mmCIF file with all atom_site columns, C-alpha atoms in Angstrom:
data_model
loop_
_atom_site.group_PDB
_atom_site.id
_atom_site.type_symbol
_atom_site.label_atom_id
_atom_site.label_alt_id
_atom_site.label_comp_id
_atom_site.label_asym_id
_atom_site.label_entity_id
_atom_site.label_seq_id
_atom_site.pdbx_PDB_ins_code
_atom_site.Cartn_x
_atom_site.Cartn_y
_atom_site.Cartn_z
_atom_site.occupancy
_atom_site.B_iso_or_equiv
_atom_site.pdbx_formal_charge
_atom_site.auth_seq_id
_atom_site.auth_comp_id
_atom_site.auth_asym_id
_atom_site.auth_atom_id
_atom_site.pdbx_PDB_model_num
ATOM 1   C CA . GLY F 1 1  ? 1.823   179.019 52.352 1.00 0.00 ? 7  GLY F CA 1
ATOM 2   C CA . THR F 1 2  ? 2.945   180.048 48.801 1.00 0.00 ? 8  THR F CA 1
ATOM 3   C CA . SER F 1 3  ? 6.246   178.279 49.828 1.00 0.00 ? 9  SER F CA 1
ATOM 4   C CA . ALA F 1 4  ? 4.747   175.506 51.607 1.00 0.00 ? 10 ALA F CA 1
ATOM 5   C CA . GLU F 1 5  ? 2.908   174.893 47.877 1.00 0.00 ? 11 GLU F CA 1
ATOM 6   C CA . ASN F 1 6  ? 5.983   175.678 45.839 1.00 0.00 ? 12 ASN F CA 1
ATOM 7   C CA . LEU F 1 7  ? 8.236   173.068 47.922 1.00 0.00 ? 13 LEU F CA 1
ATOM 8   C CA . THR F 1 8  ? 5.326   170.340 47.912 1.00 0.00 ? 14 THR F CA 1
ATOM 9   C CA . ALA F 1 9  ? 5.440   170.570 44.317 1.00 0.00 ? 15 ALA F CA 1
ATOM 10  C CA . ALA F 1 10 ? 8.924   170.105 43.984 1.00 0.00 ? 16 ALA F CA 1
ATOM 11  C CA . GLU F 1 11 ? 8.960   167.315 46.733 1.00 0.00 ? 17 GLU F CA 1
ATOM 12  C CA . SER F 1 12 ? 6.047   165.680 44.643 1.00 0.00 ? 18 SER F CA 1
ATOM 13  C CA . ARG F 1 13 ? 8.035   166.167 41.383 1.00 0.00 ? 19 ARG F CA 1
ATOM 14  C CA . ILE F 1 14 ? 10.671  164.532 42.884 1.00 0.00 ? 20 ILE F CA 1
ATOM 15  C CA . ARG F 1 15 ? 9.545   161.308 45.030 1.00 0.00 ? 21 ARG F CA 1
ATOM 16  C CA . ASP F 1 16 ? 6.125   160.653 43.333 1.00 0.00 ? 22 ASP F CA 1
ATOM 17  C CA . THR F 1 17 ? 5.870   158.701 40.386 1.00 0.00 ? 23 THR F CA 1
ATOM 18  C CA . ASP F 1 18 ? 3.899   159.448 37.059 1.00 0.00 ? 24 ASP F CA 1
ATOM 19  C CA . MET F 1 19 ? 1.441   156.505 36.967 1.00 0.00 ? 25 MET F CA 1
ATOM 20  C CA . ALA F 1 20 ? 1.575   156.221 32.876 1.00 0.00 ? 26 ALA F CA 1
ATOM 21  C CA . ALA F 1 21 ? 5.043   155.517 32.602 1.00 0.00 ? 27 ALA F CA 1
ATOM 22  C CA . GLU F 1 22 ? 5.673   152.932 34.557 1.00 0.00 ? 28 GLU F CA 1
ATOM 23  C CA . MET F 1 23 ? 2.014   151.361 33.499 1.00 0.00 ? 29 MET F CA 1
ATOM 24  C CA . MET F 1 24 ? 4.472   151.129 30.022 1.00 0.00 ? 30 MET F CA 1
ATOM 25  C CA . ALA F 1 25 ? 6.924   150.177 31.643 1.00 0.00 ? 31 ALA F CA 1
ATOM 26  C CA . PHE F 1 26 ? 4.746   147.489 33.554 1.00 0.00 ? 32 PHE F CA 1
ATOM 27  C CA . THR F 1 27 ? 2.975   146.554 30.417 1.00 0.00 ? 33 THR F CA 1
ATOM 28  C CA . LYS F 1 28 ? 6.828   146.026 28.319 1.00 0.00 ? 34 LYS F CA 1
ATOM 29  C CA . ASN F 1 29 ? 8.513   143.820 31.319 1.00 0.00 ? 35 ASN F CA 1
ATOM 30  C CA . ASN F 1 30 ? 5.008   141.510 31.017 1.00 0.00 ? 36 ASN F CA 1
ATOM 31  C CA . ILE F 1 31 ? 5.101   141.366 27.577 1.00 0.00 ? 37 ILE F CA 1
ATOM 32  C CA . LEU F 1 32 ? 8.626   140.446 27.359 1.00 0.00 ? 38 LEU F CA 1
ATOM 33  C CA . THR F 1 33 ? 8.022   137.568 30.444 1.00 0.00 ? 39 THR F CA 1
ATOM 34  C CA . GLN F 1 34 ? 5.498   135.926 28.291 1.00 0.00 ? 40 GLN F CA 1
ATOM 35  C CA . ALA F 1 35 ? 7.946   135.718 25.307 1.00 0.00 ? 41 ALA F CA 1
ATOM 36  C CA . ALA F 1 36 ? 10.938  134.140 27.654 1.00 0.00 ? 42 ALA F CA 1
ATOM 37  C CA . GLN F 1 37 ? 8.257   131.793 28.654 1.00 0.00 ? 43 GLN F CA 1
ATOM 38  C CA . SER F 1 38 ? 7.423   130.986 25.105 1.00 0.00 ? 44 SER F CA 1
ATOM 39  C CA . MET F 1 39 ? 10.841  130.260 24.412 1.00 0.00 ? 45 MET F CA 1
ATOM 40  C CA . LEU F 1 40 ? 12.362  128.599 27.443 1.00 0.00 ? 46 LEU F CA 1
ATOM 41  C CA . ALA F 1 41 ? 9.376   126.044 26.759 1.00 0.00 ? 47 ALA F CA 1
ATOM 42  C CA . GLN F 1 42 ? 10.517  125.819 22.391 1.00 0.00 ? 48 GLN F CA 1
ATOM 43  C CA . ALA F 1 43 ? 14.209  125.490 24.316 1.00 0.00 ? 49 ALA F CA 1
ATOM 44  C CA . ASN F 1 44 ? 13.651  122.851 26.642 1.00 0.00 ? 50 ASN F CA 1
ATOM 45  C CA . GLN F 1 45 ? 11.565  120.876 23.272 1.00 0.00 ? 51 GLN F CA 1
ATOM 46  C CA . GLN F 1 46 ? 14.357  121.155 20.783 1.00 0.00 ? 52 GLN F CA 1
ATOM 47  C CA . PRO F 1 47 ? 17.334  118.542 22.582 1.00 0.00 ? 53 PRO F CA 1
ATOM 48  C CA . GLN F 1 48 ? 15.032  115.133 21.213 1.00 0.00 ? 54 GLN F CA 1
ATOM 49  C CA . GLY F 1 49 ? 17.376  113.360 18.874 1.00 0.00 ? 55 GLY F CA 1
ATOM 50  C CA . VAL F 1 50 ? 16.058  109.844 20.621 1.00 0.00 ? 56 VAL F CA 1
ATOM 51  C CA . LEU F 1 51 ? 14.963  108.604 16.857 1.00 0.00 ? 57 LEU F CA 1
ATOM 52  C CA . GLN F 1 52 ? 18.852  108.494 16.530 1.00 0.00 ? 58 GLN F CA 1
ATOM 53  C CA . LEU F 1 53 ? 18.986  105.808 18.784 1.00 0.00 ? 59 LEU F CA 1
ATOM 54  C CA . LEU F 1 54 ? 15.999  103.680 18.463 1.00 0.00 ? 60 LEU F CA 1
ATOM 55  C CA . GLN F 1 55 ? 13.424  103.337 15.333 1.00 0.00 ? 61 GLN F CA 1
ATOM 56  C CA . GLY I 1 1  ? -11.757 210.410 41.727 1.00 0.00 ? 27 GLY I CA 1
ATOM 57  C CA . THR I 1 2  ? -12.476 210.364 37.874 1.00 0.00 ? 28 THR I CA 1
ATOM 58  C CA . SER I 1 3  ? -8.304  209.608 37.465 1.00 0.00 ? 29 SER I CA 1
ATOM 59  C CA . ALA I 1 4  ? -8.598  206.692 39.962 1.00 0.00 ? 30 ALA I CA 1
ATOM 60  C CA . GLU I 1 5  ? -11.755 205.022 38.276 1.00 0.00 ? 31 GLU I CA 1
ATOM 61  C CA . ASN I 1 6  ? -9.620  205.425 35.154 1.00 0.00 ? 32 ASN I CA 1
ATOM 62  C CA . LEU I 1 7  ? -6.625  203.804 36.587 1.00 0.00 ? 33 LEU I CA 1
ATOM 63  C CA . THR I 1 8  ? -8.671  200.904 37.836 1.00 0.00 ? 34 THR I CA 1
ATOM 64  C CA . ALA I 1 9  ? -10.398 200.305 34.909 1.00 0.00 ? 35 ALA I CA 1
ATOM 65  C CA . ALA I 1 10 ? -6.870  200.115 33.276 1.00 0.00 ? 36 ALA I CA 1
ATOM 66  C CA . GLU I 1 11 ? -4.908  198.092 35.518 1.00 0.00 ? 37 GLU I CA 1
ATOM 67  C CA . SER I 1 12 ? -8.011  195.557 35.599 1.00 0.00 ? 38 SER I CA 1
ATOM 68  C CA . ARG I 1 13 ? -7.782  195.305 32.080 1.00 0.00 ? 39 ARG I CA 1
ATOM 69  C CA . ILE I 1 14 ? -3.982  194.517 32.002 1.00 0.00 ? 40 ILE I CA 1
ATOM 70  C CA . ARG I 1 15 ? -3.848  192.142 35.036 1.00 0.00 ? 41 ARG I CA 1
ATOM 71  C CA . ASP I 1 16 ? -7.565  190.741 35.549 1.00 0.00 ? 42 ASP I CA 1
ATOM 72  C CA . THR I 1 17 ? -8.114  187.491 33.161 1.00 0.00 ? 43 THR I CA 1
ATOM 73  C CA . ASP I 1 18 ? -11.764 187.134 31.410 1.00 0.00 ? 44 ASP I CA 1
ATOM 74  C CA . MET I 1 19 ? -13.341 184.338 33.081 1.00 0.00 ? 45 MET I CA 1
ATOM 75  C CA . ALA I 1 20 ? -15.215 183.250 29.692 1.00 0.00 ? 46 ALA I CA 1
ATOM 76  C CA . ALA I 1 21 ? -11.823 182.597 27.639 1.00 0.00 ? 47 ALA I CA 1
ATOM 77  C CA . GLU I 1 22 ? -10.557 180.751 30.914 1.00 0.00 ? 48 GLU I CA 1
ATOM 78  C CA . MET I 1 23 ? -13.100 178.570 31.075 1.00 0.00 ? 49 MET I CA 1
ATOM 79  C CA . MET I 1 24 ? -13.248 177.367 27.239 1.00 0.00 ? 50 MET I CA 1
ATOM 80  C CA . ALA I 1 25 ? -9.267  177.036 27.419 1.00 0.00 ? 51 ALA I CA 1
ATOM 81  C CA . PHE I 1 26 ? -9.982  174.454 30.640 1.00 0.00 ? 52 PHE I CA 1
ATOM 82  C CA . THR I 1 27 ? -12.281 173.012 28.928 1.00 0.00 ? 53 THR I CA 1
ATOM 83  C CA . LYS I 1 28 ? -10.626 172.083 25.635 1.00 0.00 ? 54 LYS I CA 1
ATOM 84  C CA . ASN I 1 29 ? -7.583  171.127 27.559 1.00 0.00 ? 55 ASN I CA 1
ATOM 85  C CA . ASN I 1 30 ? -9.289  168.361 29.826 1.00 0.00 ? 56 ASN I CA 1
ATOM 86  C CA . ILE I 1 31 ? -11.315 167.337 26.688 1.00 0.00 ? 57 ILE I CA 1
ATOM 87  C CA . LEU I 1 32 ? -7.681  166.591 25.232 1.00 0.00 ? 58 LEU I CA 1
ATOM 88  C CA . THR I 1 33 ? -5.833  164.892 28.331 1.00 0.00 ? 59 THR I CA 1
ATOM 89  C CA . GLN I 1 34 ? -8.953  162.628 28.125 1.00 0.00 ? 60 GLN I CA 1
ATOM 90  C CA . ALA I 1 35 ? -8.193  162.014 24.361 1.00 0.00 ? 61 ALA I CA 1
ATOM 91  C CA . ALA I 1 36 ? -4.475  161.384 25.075 1.00 0.00 ? 62 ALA I CA 1
ATOM 92  C CA . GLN I 1 37 ? -5.459  159.359 27.864 1.00 0.00 ? 63 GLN I CA 1
ATOM 93  C CA . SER I 1 38 ? -7.657  156.960 25.762 1.00 0.00 ? 64 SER I CA 1
ATOM 94  C CA . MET I 1 39 ? -4.751  156.900 22.971 1.00 0.00 ? 65 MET I CA 1
ATOM 95  C CA . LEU I 1 40 ? -2.514  155.858 25.286 1.00 0.00 ? 66 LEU I CA 1
ATOM 96  C CA . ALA I 1 41 ? -4.333  152.926 26.702 1.00 0.00 ? 67 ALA I CA 1
ATOM 97  C CA . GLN I 1 42 ? -4.797  151.878 23.072 1.00 0.00 ? 68 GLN I CA 1
ATOM 98  C CA . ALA I 1 43 ? -1.057  152.519 22.660 1.00 0.00 ? 69 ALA I CA 1
ATOM 99  C CA . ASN I 1 44 ? -0.434  150.162 25.514 1.00 0.00 ? 70 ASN I CA 1
ATOM 100 C CA . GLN I 1 45 ? -2.608  147.370 23.939 1.00 0.00 ? 71 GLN I CA 1
ATOM 101 C CA . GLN I 1 46 ? -1.097  147.751 20.806 1.00 0.00 ? 72 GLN I CA 1
ATOM 102 C CA . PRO I 1 47 ? 2.161   145.772 20.797 1.00 0.00 ? 73 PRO I CA 1
ATOM 103 C CA . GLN I 1 48 ? 0.599   142.223 21.543 1.00 0.00 ? 74 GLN I CA 1
ATOM 104 C CA . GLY I 1 49 ? 2.342   139.834 18.867 1.00 0.00 ? 75 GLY I CA 1
ATOM 105 C CA . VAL I 1 50 ? 2.442   136.990 21.548 1.00 0.00 ? 76 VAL I CA 1
ATOM 106 C CA . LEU I 1 51 ? 0.811   134.749 19.110 1.00 0.00 ? 77 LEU I CA 1
ATOM 107 C CA . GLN I 1 52 ? 3.516   134.261 16.830 1.00 0.00 ? 78 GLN I CA 1
ATOM 108 C CA . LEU I 1 53 ? 5.280   132.188 19.731 1.00 0.00 ? 79 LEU I CA 1
ATOM 109 C CA . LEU I 1 54 ? 2.715   129.846 21.365 1.00 0.00 ? 80 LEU I CA 1
ATOM 110 C CA . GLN I 1 55 ? -0.556  128.692 19.940 1.00 0.00 ? 81 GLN I CA 1
#
């Protein structure tokens, strides 16, 4: 029983994930995704030099 | 018999634990865990500056 509990703890620490750290990373990546979305929406509008030609 | 009782008292005081003190410590640590959980939930929401970019 003692050995099984100790090895279970070891295997948990090796393979299982901490919820808090992954939550942090996921929120960070979502915020970065939104930022890149807005930046791309701006960059698509940036090349508008049609007022050179017409008037 | 006398010596056995005295050494039993000594061994109890050395190795056995007082329930009240450990109960106190456990309640304290639970309260601290909850506080840290709430603080982390707040800190994850703190970086939201998406309203700079879009509108």
